[PDB]
Amino acid sequence: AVRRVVANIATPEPARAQAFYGDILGMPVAMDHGWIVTHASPLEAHAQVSFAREGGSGTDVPDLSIEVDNFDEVHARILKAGLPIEYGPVTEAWGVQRLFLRDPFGKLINILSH
Amino acid sequence: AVRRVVANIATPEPARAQAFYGDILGMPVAMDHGWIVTHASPLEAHAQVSFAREGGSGTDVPDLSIEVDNFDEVHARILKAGLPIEYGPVTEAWGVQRLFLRDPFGKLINILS
Ligand SMILES: [Zn+2]
């Protein structure tokens, strides 16, 4: 029985995650073993993994899809941090509002909300 | 504010996930769309993502870390499926037993308990 699935992003300096996952996405550090750092949300979700031929609407497949509960807030934080947005925001036909942007490690992040 | 973190694996054919995520890990299709297919478990944890200089014990950083309740059963399933194990099983210093293997898409998967 699968309890959690966690993506691991390779970096010589895990502290580089703080600016995006910590500050913008509001995920405090949950575990810090030095060679690995985990950022986590106060919430609480089924273990899942997705397999995709495109990101939808003809986009590239994002490395991670991160669902947030106040999209307009996250959007404003991203803008205030001066981060370029690669796609969106746009409301998709399948009933999400989302944008793509790059994280500190060049991963393509899909930030979405119901 | 973050409700979920889900990795997406790029593939021309999502159906190829069933052999590993479905048949070995016991995560059935929760959603099929079918440009995208999500496999899911009935268990929950905090949404999280990790950032690592190495996989631990000098290993490569695994693409995914997947925590399972019944390590010995998964290990047996893996072997019976004829899948090569790249690392382990071994019990690590940070209180886990784990092994690494490749998924259908070439991703390095850390299965741990
Ligand atoms: Zn990299």
Report the distance separating Cα B80 and Cα B78, nearest Å. Answer: 6
Indicate the number of domains in chain A. Answer: 1
A14: closest CA among A49, A30, A38, A40?
A: A38
Handedness of CA B25, B26, B30, B34 (dihedral sign): positive
Is B48 close to A39, i.e. CB distance below 8 A?
Answer: yes
Instruction: Select from A2, A63, A105 the Cβ nearest to the Cβ of B41.
Output: A2
Whether residue A107 lies inside any domain: the answer is yes
Report the distance separating Cα B46 and Cα A89, nearest Å. Answer: 26
Instruction: Give B113 Cα–ligand 1 centroid separation in angstroms.
Output: 26
**A8 contacts on B by Cβ (under 8 Å):** 49-52, 55, 61-65, 110
- CB atoms under 10 Å from CB of B34, counted, come to 13
Instruction: Give A60 Cα–ligand 1 centroid separation in angstroms.
Output: 17
E strands of B33-107, at which residues? 36-52, 64-68, 85-91, 97-102
Query: Which CATH number do you get for residue B94?
Result: 3.10.180.10
B22: left (phi over 0), alpha (psi -120 to 50) or beta: alpha
Is B39 close to A27, i.e. CB distance below 8 A?
Answer: no
Minimal-distance CA residue of chain B relative to A68: B2
Whether residue B2 lies inside any domain: the answer is no
CA distances to A4, B2, B83 from A73, rounded to whole Å, are: 27, 12, 45
For residues B49-64, one letter each, b for 16 or more C-beta atoms within 10 angstroms of the residue's C-beta and e for the rest, the string is bbbbeebbeebebbbb
Tell me, what DSSP letter sits at residue A25?
T
Instruction: Give A62 Cα–ligand 1 centroid separation in angstroms.
Output: 14
Is B64 close to A49, i.e. CB distance below 8 A?
Answer: yes
Tell me how long chain B is. 113
Q: Would you state the structure tokens that stand for residue A32, as one six-digit string?
A: 């810090």
Whether residue B57 lies inside any domain: the answer is yes
CA distances to A46, A47, B85 from B3, rounded to whole Å, are: 10, 12, 33
**A23 contacts on B by Cβ (under 8 Å):** none
Tell me how long chain A is. 114
Whether residue A8 lies inside any domain: the answer is no
Domain region containing B52: 13-113
Report the distance separating Cα A46 and Cα A28, nearest Å. Answer: 20
Chain B interface mutation, best of A24, A51, A68, highest count of B Cβ atoms under 10 Å: A51
**A10 contacts on B by Cβ (under 8 Å):** 52-53, 61
Report the distance separating Cα B90 and Cα B104, nearest Å. Answer: 23
Minimal-distance CA residue of chain B relative to A46: B44
Minimal-distance CA residue of chain A relative to B52: A36
Q: Would you state the structure tokens that stand for residue B84, as one six-digit string?
A: 């090569």
